Structure 1
Amino acid sequence: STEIKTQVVVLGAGPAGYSAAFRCADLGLETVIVERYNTLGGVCLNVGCIPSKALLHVAKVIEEAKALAEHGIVFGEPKTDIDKIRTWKEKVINQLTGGLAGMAKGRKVKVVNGLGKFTGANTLEVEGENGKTVINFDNAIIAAGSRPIQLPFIPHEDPRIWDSTDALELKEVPERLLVMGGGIIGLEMGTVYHALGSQIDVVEMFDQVIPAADKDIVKVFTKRISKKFNLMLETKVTAVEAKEDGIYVTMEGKKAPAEPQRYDAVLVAIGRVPNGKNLDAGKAGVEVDDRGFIRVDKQLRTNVPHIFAIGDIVGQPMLAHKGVHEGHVAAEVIAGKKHYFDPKVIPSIAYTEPEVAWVGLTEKEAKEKGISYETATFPWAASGRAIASDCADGMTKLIFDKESHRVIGGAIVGTNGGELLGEIGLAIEMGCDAEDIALTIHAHPTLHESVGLAAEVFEGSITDLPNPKA
């Protein structure tokens, strides 16, 4: 039994956790990280955002190489070696995890490996490689993240029923693969495996993939992927059975095939749930709600004043950049700064082909909350940059308060569309109106100039399009 005393213990080492710990250290606090896996970086680095972006980049090049054939540059069919692809994915991750371990050492943040559970209001017990460590803390930051949802009628134990982690292991390219759920994670993995040779089926219970994103934005994306995938909207899996020749999924719904279909693999990507029930947090007095979230205020503080919680485990949206910024505020508060986490906006990007990206209010949300709004759209069919890069179906959309003309949201569907979110996010945070945006000179020819041109549509000054507001 080892025993340790620290000012701050951080439970979990994903983007929220290690950002919190590193901020604590930089502010002079003695800090320990507890992490049950052998590397830092949590879900995002090891089995999430980073490996999936790496495989989506390979997928994007493969598709760009083929699109060039009509242009007079003819590549031969790519010879694939999924073992080398995997070994490169693994190299990318190890470079980043080593760099995290190195910054933890440079900041003198101790890393304790093993599973942590609260035993008192100031006591954390870790069960790991070195036996049990008892950690006495002045403050705790819970950052234990989330986990994939499983369905019970599914034989999840079968090695052909995948979660997102299985899909990112890249153990094989199944001839026919089903994606359950039209969420971003599922569509990204379908994008990857299609580029590698898989026939992709997608079953989604609602009337559109990516349900949070606006209809006009998703209409463009759906038109594209409806040629690469067989997409079953308003359809539900009603039973799954594992046989020796493949997994049999019977569906009920509009597009549901009559007969049980056969697949070589099934990716279950129907969402994620928080890990808040698995920490004995109640032994420290911490309130955990019915869904397993640990609720916090805008200083990321739980109902126990010296215990904070950050990242996926406190609520939606479950995204790495939210967790990172929450980790900074939690560390700053503990260090004595009167800081709060209250962003106007949090961006979301689907790294699909084309990308779908949005920030601030959607039209759905604006309608619910009763905001009087007006949209302005720039079609990429009029963008020389987009035509010259074969992405002319894209679209850039801004959303403005009708009366004040301030921007309150925006969205892009298109190749490299995610990178345009930076300007729109900043515009909302700075309180820009359409005129502020339209009058800023944007570089031509670029995709991001479509943000200024959308503002010009609203202002009635646009000249790269017909101008109905003249």
Structure 2
Amino acid sequence: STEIKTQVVVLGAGPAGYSAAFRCADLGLETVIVERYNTLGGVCLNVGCIPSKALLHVAKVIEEAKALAEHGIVFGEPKTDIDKIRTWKEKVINQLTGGLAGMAKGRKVKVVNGLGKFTGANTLEVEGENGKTVINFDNAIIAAGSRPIQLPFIPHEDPRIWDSTDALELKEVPERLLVMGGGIIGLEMGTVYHALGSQIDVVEMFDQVIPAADKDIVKVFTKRISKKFNLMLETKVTAVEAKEDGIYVTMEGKKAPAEPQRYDAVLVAIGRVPNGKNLDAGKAGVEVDDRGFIRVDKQLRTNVPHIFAIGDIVGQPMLAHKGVHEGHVAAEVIAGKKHYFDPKVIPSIAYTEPEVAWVGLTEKEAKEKGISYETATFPWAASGRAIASDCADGMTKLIFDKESHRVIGGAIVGTNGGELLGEIGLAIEMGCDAEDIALTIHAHPTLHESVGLAAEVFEGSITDLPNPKAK
């Protein structure tokens, strides 16, 4: 065995973890990062956002190429080699995980391979293949992330029952695939496999996919994917049978078929739960809650002043950008700076086609916390760029506080829609009002000028559309 000592040890090397660690190094702190897997970057880099975007990019080009056929460019069908696609994806990932190790070396952050668990309130041991390493620390940042949900009546040991990780290994292209969960992750994998040939069924208990998004926004999305997928909303999987020739799924609800359906694979994309209970947090005084989260305060302090928690392990939303930013705050706080983590806004994007992107308050949220608001919408059907890009069903929506006229939220549905959120997130943060946005000159013809036009709709000054607001 062996024993070492530093100021800061970080547990987990996803976006939250290594962000904190690198920020610690840069603030002149002595840092060690503990990670159980062979590479850094955690879920996001290895089995998450990045691999997903690579496959989604491929799926998009395929679908866009095919659409050109009726305009005079006929590619015919792709000859496809999933093994090479898989190799590309692995190349993209390895490039980035290399950079991460590289930068970890440049910042002299020691990396330790093992599963780490808390010994005492100042001691953490990692049992990695290497040996038993005991770590003595002044400060600890817990960043151990989350994992996919499993149901108990489901045969999760059968290789045809997939979690997201399995979907992204791109083992095969199932002829008929069931997606359990009309959430973001599930809808994205649906998009990938449909491009590659799979027939897609989605089963969702709620009455709309992407439950958190507004109704009008998801209405546009749904009218788009219901052409591609078989959507079974307000419907529920009651039984799952592993048979030789398939997975037999029995459903009940509004769209349930009478008989059990046979599928070649089933992706269970129900959600994710925190890894809070697996660190022996108890043995360092840190309190885990019932659901698995390690609750923290504006400074990312656990109930143990010198032990911090960041990322998915801390609560919704389980998004990468959240983790990074909390990681920075947590490092800065340890390094003495008086900083706090409280963003008024956190963006969310579904990178389906069309994309569904939103930030700030949704109508639902305001309609519930009793905020009085007005919305303004610009439909892409009136957008030169959108028509010319053959993506003319989409809308940009801004949500204003009706007496301050301040922008409190925004949403997009459309191709490359997610790239419009930067402007909206910035405006909310800066306290912009409709006039500020409307009078900013937006390039023509872009999609993002729809943001400014939405504002003009509010101001009742818009000319690119019939204008009922003024006389």
* TM tier relative to shorter chain: over 0.9
Amino-acid identity (%): 100
- The alignment's TM-score, normalised by the length of structure 1, stands at 1.00
- The alignment's TM-score, normalised by the length of structure 2, stands at 1.00
CA distance in 2, matches of 1:77, 1:261: 29
Q: 1:232-291 deviations in whole A, cap 9, x for unaligned?
A: 000000000000000000001110000010000000000000000000001100011010
Moved over 3 A (4+): none
CA distance in 1, matches of 2:79, 2:374: 49
Secondary structure at the residue paired with 1:228? coil
Is the 2:386–2:447 contact (alpha carbons within 8 Å) kept by the matching residues of 1? yes
CA distance in 2, matches of 1:413, 1:441: 22
CA distance in 1, matches of 2:218, 2:293: 30
Q: CA offset at residue 318 of structure 1?
A: 0.2
Is the 2:180–2:269 contact (alpha carbons within 8 Å) kept by the matching residues of 1? yes
CA distance in 1, matches of 2:130, 2:69: 58
CA distance in 1, matches of 2:213, 2:314: 22
CA distance in 1, matches of 2:41, 2:459: 45
Is the 2:66–2:76 contact (alpha carbons within 8 Å) kept by the matching residues of 1? no
Secondary structure at the residue paired with 2:227? helix
Q: CA offset at residue 129 of structure 1?
A: 1.6
Give the equivalent residue in structure 2 for 1:457.
Answer: 457
CA distance in 1, matches of 2:468, 2:426: 28
Secondary structure at the residue paired with 1:444? coil
Q: CA offset at residue 66 of structure 1?
A: 0.9
Is the 2:149–2:273 contact (alpha carbons within 8 Å) kept by the matching residues of 1? yes
Give the equivalent residue in structure 2 for 1:114.
Answer: 114
CA distance in 1, matches of 2:431, 2:301: 28
Secondary structure at the residue paired with 1:292? coil
Q: 1:297-318 deviations in whole A, cap 9, x for unaligned?
A: 0100011000000000000000
Q: CA offset at residue 12 of structure 1?
A: 0.2
Secondary structure at the residue paired with 2:159? coil
Q: CA offset at residue 104 of structure 1?
A: 0.1
Q: 1:78-126 deviations in whole A, cap 9, x for unaligned?
A: 1000000000000000000000000000000000011000010000000
Secondary structure at the residue paired with 1:131? coil
Q: 1:344-400 deviations in whole A, cap 9, x for unaligned?
A: 100000000100000000000001100000000000000000000111110000000
Moved more, 316-325 or 71-80: 71-80
CA RMSD of aligned residues (A): 0.4
Secondary structure at the residue paired with 1:140? strand
Q: CA offset at residue 76 of structure 1?
A: 2.0
Q: CA offset at residue 332 of structure 1?
A: 0.2
CA distance in 1, matches of 2:233, 2:61: 29
* Paired positions, count: 470
Secondary structure at the residue paired with 1:227? coil
Q: CA offset at residue 71 of structure 1?
A: 0.8
CA distance in 2, matches of 1:29, 1:227: 54
Q: 1:167-212 deviations in whole A, cap 9, x for unaligned?
A: 0000000000000000000000000000000000000001000000
| Unmatched segments (≥5 aa) in structure 1 | none
Q: CA offset at residue 130 of structure 1?
A: 1.0
CA distance in 1, matches of 2:371, 2:108: 49
Secondary structure at the residue paired with 2:297? coil
| Unmatched segments (≥5 aa) in structure 2 | none
Give the equivalent residue in structure 2 for 1:60.
Answer: 60
Q: CA offset at residue 410 of structure 1?
A: 0.2
Secondary structure at the residue paired with 1:251? strand
Secondary structure at the residue paired with 2:114? strand
CA distance in 1, matches of 2:282, 2:436: 50
CA distance in 2, matches of 1:115, 1:296: 23
Secondary structure at the residue paired with 1:167? helix
Secondary structure at the residue paired with 1:242? strand
Q: CA offset at residue 3 of structure 1?
A: 0.2
Moved more, 308-317 or 70-79: 70-79
CA distance in 1, matches of 2:167, 2:4: 39
CA distance in 2, matches of 1:33, 1:469: 58
Give the equivalent residue in structure 2 for 1:294.
Answer: 294
Is the 2:120–2:284 contact (alpha carbons within 8 Å) kept by the matching residues of 1? yes
Give the equivalent residue in structure 2 for 1:239.
Answer: 239
Q: 1:28-55 deviations in whole A, cap 9, x for unaligned?
A: 0000000000000000000000000000
Matching of residue 381 in structure 1 with residue 397 in structure 2: no
Give the equivalent residue in structure 2 for 1:15.
Answer: 15
Q: CA offset at residue 419 of structure 1?
A: 0.2
Q: CA offset at residue 131 of structure 1?
A: 1.1
Q: Structure 2 matches for 1:193-272, cutoff 5 A?
A: 193-272=193-272
Secondary structure at the residue paired with 2:226? helix
CA distance in 1, matches of 2:124, 2:248: 45
